[PDB]
Design a protein around this ligand. Structure first.
Ligand SMILES: C[C@]12CC[C@H](O)C[C@H]1CC[C@@H]1[C@@H]2C[C@@H](O)[C@]2(C)[C@@H](C3=CC(=O)OC3)CC[C@]12O
Lengths: 225, 211
């Protein structure tokens, strides 16, 4: 039905510019006042920009006003957000949202009833860095028993995210991937997998770590010892 | 700006329980207060708008109420698909402001952590670094402490911990403690211990090893 998809997010340098997009579906785009809202790394929601129908007026909070610009292409069903002079405080997940009703006399007008998945903006001077992947295998006499836990250490990468699957997804159960911790401006997270001691070392378990930012894929087969 | 205040950031409850989330405005916003729901890696969803009007598709076991400066959101039969973060929001004064959010946990029976210790890899040793990792998985409640001892001696320098959000299948938590050292200091020592203190055991769960 109703669709909103943000686009254009990425890694930017402080003082840099970025343009975001929101393609819409399942409703008459030209009937709504469209808005942007961002969510902060501290999970804090903040208003960014609003535009009325006809692109005659636009609202910006003092946090973004004078730097960002909202516009609409009613023929393309697209909403834009030009960002400029960006700082670290602008690092956030940016969403486009649609009100519940085009009629001010309807109280749904004063609510955002549909959001997009969001597009991630990170304002950093830190550098895109590929992950090192280390195998975590038990050692060296504790072979007991019922279950065995393996793992992969993904270390020193930038930016986020990193994707971690086990056996090309063949292993979904018993998997625990953890939130990354920042350390010297480089991320580090860990992934554990628990399998019966029967399908390992017999049979194979391998961690697949994808880091799209650096276009890297690493497969780390967990071997005894 | 009107400040939106939710008095607790975390709330715990059982399946079939009546949950109540409170939201306070610094001003009179009349009835212009909406409620949103958001799961860990998910999109924001509108639940209630104005003070007490449900959005289409939202279960009737969700109800909002309040006027002026004090509002609340009640969930009548807590289900595990109700485990999310809830935000309150005012829509009448510019700029429109949100509350800090209230993350709602689910209650279950006590589970003991499965502790696993791993030594540095030959590949990481190849780089002049050495991290000892400890997994403390599938425990409840969330309250847990970890202690590293390098040759009987405690240590907090170089230790890093990370936590998973509550698991979807078993409602447990998992944690990872990683003691990162220099290859050289790693080898001027033999033994390395991972200790876990939890509400379950009275004696710690100890995972050690040595070279
Ligand atoms: C942008 C907007 C529409 C044009 C009119 O000139 C008034 C402006 C400012 C006020 C602004 C409307 C758009 C509407 O969508 C809003 C965003 C609407 C809100 C929805 C909401 O959640 O908070 C406010 C109420 C009114 C609103 O805040």
């Amino acid at each position: 039905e109703v669709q909103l998809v943000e686009s254009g997010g990425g890694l930017v340098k402080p003082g840099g510019s970025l343009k975001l997009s929101c393609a819409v579906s399942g409703f008459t785009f030209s009937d709504y006042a469209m808005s942007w809202i961002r969510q902060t790394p501290e999970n804090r929601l903040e208003w960014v920009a609003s535009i009325n129908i006809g692109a005659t007026y636009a609202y910006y909070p003092d946090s973004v006003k004078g730097r960002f610009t909202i516009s609409r292409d009613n023929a393309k069903n697209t909403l834009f957000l030009q960002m400029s002079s960006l700082g670290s405080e602008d690092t956030a997940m940016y969403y486009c949202a649609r009100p519940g009703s085009p009629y001010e006399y309807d109280k749904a007008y004063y609510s955002m009833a549909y959001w997009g998945p969001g597009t991630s903006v990170t304002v950093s001077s830190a550098k895109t860095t590929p992950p090192s992947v280390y195998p975590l295998a038990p050692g060296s006499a504790a072979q007991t028993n019922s279950m065995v836990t393996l793992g992969c250490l993904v270390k020193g990468y930038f930016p986020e995210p990193v994707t971690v699957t086990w056996n090309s997804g063949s292993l979904s159960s018993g998997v625990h991937t953890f939130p990354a911790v920042l350390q010297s401006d480089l991320y580090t997270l860990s992934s554990s997998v628990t399998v019966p001691s029967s399908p390992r070392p017999s049979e194979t378990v391998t961690c697949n770590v994808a880091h799209p930012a650096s276009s890297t894929k690493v497969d780390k087969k967990i071997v005894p010892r | 700006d009107v400040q939106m205040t939710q008095s607790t950031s975390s709330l715990s409850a059982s399946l079939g329980d009546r949950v109540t989330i409170s939201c306070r405005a610094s001003q009179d916003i009349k009835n212009y207060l909406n409620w949103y729901q958001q799961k860990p890696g998910g999109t924001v969803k509108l639940l209630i708008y104005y003070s007490s009007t449900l959005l289409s598709g939202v279960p009737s076991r969700f109800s909002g109420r309040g006027s002026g400066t004090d509002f609340s959101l009640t969930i009548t039969n807590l289900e595990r698909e109700d485990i999310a973060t809830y935000f309150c929001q005012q829509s009448i004064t510019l700029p429109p402001t949100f509350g800090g959010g209230t993350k709602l946990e689910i209650k279950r029976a006590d589970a003991a952590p499965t502790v696993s210790i791993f030594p540095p890899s030959s590949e990481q040793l190849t780089s002049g670094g050495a991290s000892v990792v400890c997994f403390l998985n599938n425990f409840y409640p969330k309250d847990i402490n970890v202690k590293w001892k390098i040759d009987g001696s405690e240590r907090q320098n170089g230790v890093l911990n990370s936590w998973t959000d509550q698991d979807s299948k078993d409602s447990t938590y998992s944690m990872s403690s990683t003691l990162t050292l220099t290859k050289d200091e790693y080898e001027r020592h033999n033994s390395y211990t991972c200790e876990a203190t939890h509400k379950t055991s009275t004696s710690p769960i100890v995972k050690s090893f040595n070279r």
